[PDB]
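Q: I'm writing a short explainer about zinc finger protein HRX for a general audience and would like to include a description of its predicted shape. Could you first generate the structure from this sequence?
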Amino acid sequence: GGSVKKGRRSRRCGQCPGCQVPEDCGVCTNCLDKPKFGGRNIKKQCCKMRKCQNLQWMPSKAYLQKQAKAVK
Ligand SMILES: [Zn+2]
Ligand SMILES: [Zn+2]
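A: Of course. Here's the predicted structure. Afterward I'll give you a sentence or two in plain language.
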């Protein structure tokens, strides 16, 4: 259930508004959903301000399963 299926490889940049947030903004639905923000840690979702904006993506190869290694 928590595995990649209809998606591709993605890696957050690490220098955007999202990646620069190591804490909970405390004002977005996700954060406010936390007890410390009045919530109840029931929704405990990814902070809207934390979610990366720019990540490295690449086409999937689960359907092709081609080869791209140093065959020898
Ligand atoms: Zn937030
Ligand atoms: Zn980022």
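A: For your explainer, you could say: Strands lie at 9-12, 55-58.
Q: Perfect, that's easy to follow.
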